[PDB]
Structures are given as structure tokens and as C-alpha cells.
Design an enzyme around this catalytic site. Structure first.
Site, PDB file in Angstrom:
ATOM      1  CG  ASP A  88      -2.129  -0.880   1.140  1.00  0.00           C
ATOM      2  OD1 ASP A  88      -2.586  -1.236   0.024  1.00  0.00           O
ATOM      3  OD2 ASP A  88      -2.658  -1.249   2.227  1.00  0.00           O
ATOM      4  CG  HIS A 130      -5.926   5.486   6.188  1.00  0.00           C
ATOM      5  ND1 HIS A 130      -7.087   5.186   6.872  1.00  0.00           N
ATOM      6  CD2 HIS A 130      -6.278   5.685   4.896  1.00  0.00           C
ATOM      7  CE1 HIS A 130      -8.102   5.194   6.013  1.00  0.00           C
ATOM      8  NE2 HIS A 130      -7.639   5.524   4.816  1.00  0.00           N
ATOM      9  CG  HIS A 167     -10.857   3.568   2.786  1.00  0.00           C
ATOM     10  ND1 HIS A 167     -10.793   4.210   1.552  1.00  0.00           N
ATOM     11  CD2 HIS A 167     -10.823   2.235   2.516  1.00  0.00           C
ATOM     12  CE1 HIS A 167     -10.721   3.300   0.597  1.00  0.00           C
ATOM     13  NE2 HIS A 167     -10.757   2.099   1.141  1.00  0.00           N
ATOM     14  CG  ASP A 254     -12.132   6.741  -1.268  1.00  0.00           C
ATOM     15  OD1 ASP A 254     -12.872   7.536  -0.659  1.00  0.00           O
ATOM     16  OD2 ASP A 254     -11.100   6.219  -0.734  1.00  0.00           O
TER      17      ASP A 254
HETATM   18 ZN   LIG Z   1     -10.484   6.189   1.037  1.00  0.00          ZN
END
Ligand SMILES: [Zn+2]
Ligand SMILES: [K+]
Lengths: 363, 5
Positions: A88, A130, A167, A254
Site C-alpha cells: 500500500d 491513515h 475509509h 472514493d
Molecule cells: Zn479512502
């Protein structure tokens, strides 16, 4: 009163080099420029984050590792897995300096808000929420959202982080898990196996921060009307209970129909209603990007939202510009939802909302 | 850890 737009050609070129979104920053800026929206904003060149700024959240050991593998793009360094680098988050040559530039851009936006230069400041290449203090994660190397919030803490006593990315904004929630100065609110896909795996409605923070994290777990297929109903209900309650002095808003694209992740089924109009609701609070607001892996649709989305910020109605036709052919064959700004089912059942959404209301009573 | 991607 005029919004700040964080931009320079050098900055956009660095952001174009991110492994999972090549050229996206150029497409977004190019389309904003094509609609002449930059002429209505105050363009501010970002400053680069210093090591001292980065180290107010990230650990010395992690920053040192990122700097080391960044120098030549050593994506085969044996120690990278401890620090979250790998599939990632590859060690792209230069990534330390690219991430420092994005961190600095978000800090620059925050500083503009502190100084009262503007009420809204935009960094569409930020939103990398993140990353943890000692770990890259989820295409994020430095957590510019956390760095922006920590800059805002100089002036603004309470800060609301609102995440509308697909997310869970887990790095930001973790960073502030134990404090009540920052409330985090995240609307995101929640399903076992789906990244990052955290953010159930029962996740409410810890210690002195208990009830100062709010999570709205959502299933595949949600469309504009239902999403806005949820978002408005939660933010109405949050605003009354927490009384934020500043907002950081993450608008990852997204969620938008056409993303290869093919999870939510939103259009920019639905996200735009959420954004309008927040803007009418008339608070210092820091706007960030985030995910978005259909590049032309991400540019359509953030260009539309820039128009929302400016109170402008944009022409449906995509104007001629460097990436015009990426918008064929119809060349319009609007995005059409996919014909697939909404897996969100009304009783479940209501129970999630009731649970959140119950938590906020403690705030 | 989860993969994003
Ligand atoms: Zn995302
Ligand atoms: K918190």
C-alpha cells in the site's frame, strides 16, 4: 472572506508522484483552472513541514526510516514492514519530501485560518488520515490531517474532524482518542475485511476522550439522499453537543459512483449538500481531499465542491484544458449513479443514529 | 493490519 487555495506548480508536481494516484493532482488543479475558479480564490504557496513540525506527531525512528528509504527509492529495504511500508505504501523515491510538502501544505492552510486570512482554506492534495505516529498506512506516509489539527489547536479550543472518505479515518481517530479537544466524526464503509477494519459505532474513544469519537458504519450502495439524511442527523447532534470552533473536513472521492473500489454509489451533489451544511456554521474550515481512484471523477468531484465553496453554479460542459480527453465521450461534469442495490436497511441506520445520540448525551 | 489496495 475569499477562500484560500493552497497551490504551486512545484507542489502539484510532487503530489503527482504519489504511487497510487499518479497525475491526479494535475488533473484536479487543471479542471479547477479550466472553470476559472482559481481567479476567485486567494492562491497561497505551501511551506514545507519542518522536521520539528512532523515530530510533534510522528516518532523520530519512523521519520528517520522514511527519510532513509526515500533518498533513492529503496522499496526493498528489509525494515520497511515494521514501519508500514510495502504494498500500500511503497518507498517511492522522494516520498519523504513529497509527504513533507503535503504536511506543510495542510499546516499552511491551518495557519491561514488562525490568522483570519480566510474562513475556508483548501488543500485538495491532503487528507492522508491513515498514517500512525510510527507507521505508514493506506497510501498515507505522514498524517497531514493530524498535523493540521495540531496547528489549529494553537487557537481553536475545540476542533471537529469530519471524514467523508470511503475509509475510516483511523489515524486521526487514534491520535485524538484520549482527548476531548478534538472530536472525530467518520462516515465510512464498515464491513469485515474492508480497510482499515476499525470504526464501528461502538468505537467512541478512550479515557478522557470517551464519547469524543463518533463512527457511522455504512454498507455498500448508499446514494445521495440517504447519505445526506445520515450526515445531517449526526452533524446536527454533534454541533449542538460539542460546539466546535473549527472544522477539518476530509472529502475523499472514493465514495463516488465509478470508483474502481465500487462500494458506495454517491455523486458530488450529495457530498456537496453535506459540505453546504458544514459551511453554514460559518466556522474556520480546512478542506482536504483523500482517496479517489477514478481520476477524472475525482477531478469532477473536487471541482464541483470548489464551486460549492464559492457559491457558483458550474457549466455542465467540461471546458477545454490539458486533460480534456480524459472526460470523453460525453464531456460533462455530472456523474450518474450505478444501477446496483443499496445494502443499507432503514432500521439499521436508525439504530446507529440512536446509539450515537445516546453517546453524545455524555458530551 | 489490512490491505487498502
Ligand atoms: Zn479512502
Ligand atoms: K477525540
Amino acid at each position: 472572506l475569499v477562500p484560500v487555495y493552497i497551490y504551486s506548480p512545484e507542489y502539484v508536481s510532487m503530489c503527482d508522484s504519489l504511487a497510487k494516484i499518479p497525475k491526479r493532482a494535475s488533473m484536479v488543479h487543471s479542471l479547477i483552472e479550466a472553470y476559472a475558479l482559481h481567479k476567485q480564490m486567494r492562491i497561497v504557496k505551501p511551506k514545507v513541514a519542518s522536521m520539528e513540525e512532523m515530530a510533534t506527531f510522528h516518532t523520530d525512528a519512523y521519520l528517520q526510516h522514511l527519510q532513509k528509504v526515500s533518498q533513492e527509492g529503496d522499496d526493498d529495504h528489509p525494515d520497511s514492514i515494521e514501519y508500514g511500508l510495502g504494498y500500500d505504501c511503497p518507498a517511492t523515491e522522494g516520498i519523504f519530501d513529497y509527504a513533507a510538502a503535503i504536511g506543510g501544505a495542510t499546516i499552511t492552510a491551518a495557519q491561514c485560518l488562525i490568522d483570519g486570512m480566510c474562513k475556508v482554506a483548501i488543500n485538495w492534495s491532503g487528507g492522508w488520515h491513515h498514517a500512525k505516529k510510527d507507521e505508514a498506512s493506506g497510501f498515507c506516509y505522514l498524517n497531514d490531517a493530524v498535523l493540521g489539527i495540531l496547528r489549529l489547536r494553537r487557537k481553536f479550543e475545540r476542533i471537529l474532524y469530519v471524514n467523508l472518505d470511503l475509509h475510516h479515518g483511523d489515524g486521526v481517530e487514534d491520535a485524538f482518542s484520549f482527548t476531548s479537544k478534538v472530536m472525530t466524526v467518520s462516515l465510512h464503509k464498515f464491513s469485515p475485511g474492508f480497510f482499515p477494519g476499525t470504526g464501528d459505532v461502538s468505537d467512541v474513544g478512550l479515557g478522557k476522550g470517551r464519547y469524543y469519537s463518533v463512527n457511522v458504519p455504512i454498507q455498500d450502495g448508499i446514494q445521495d439522499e440517504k447519505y445526506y439524511q445520515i450526515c445531517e442527523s449526526v452533524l446536527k447532534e454533534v454541533y449542538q453537543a460539542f460546539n466546535p470552533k473549527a472544522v477539518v473536513l476530509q472529502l475523499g472521492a472514493d465514495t463516488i459512483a465509478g470508483d474502481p473500489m465500487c462500494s458506495f454509489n454517491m455523486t458530488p451533489v450529495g457530498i456537496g449538500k453535506c459540505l453546504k451544511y458544514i459551511l453554514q456554521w460559518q466556522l474556520a474550515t480546512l478542506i482536504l481531499g483523500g482517496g479517489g481512484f477514478n481520476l477524472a471523477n475525482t477531478a469532477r468531484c473536487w471541482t464541483y465542491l470548489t464551486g460549492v465553496i464559492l457559491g457558483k453554479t458550474l457549466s455542465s460542459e467540461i471546458p477545454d484544458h490539458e486533460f480534456f480527453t480524459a472526460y470523453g465521450p460525453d464531456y460533462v461534469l455530472e456523474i450518474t449513479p450505478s444501477c446496483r442495490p443499496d445494502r443499507n436497511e432503514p432500521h439499521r441506520i436508525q439504530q446507529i443514529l440512536n446509539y450515537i445520540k445516546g453517546n453524545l448525551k455524555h458530551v | 493490519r489490512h490491505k487498502k489496495x
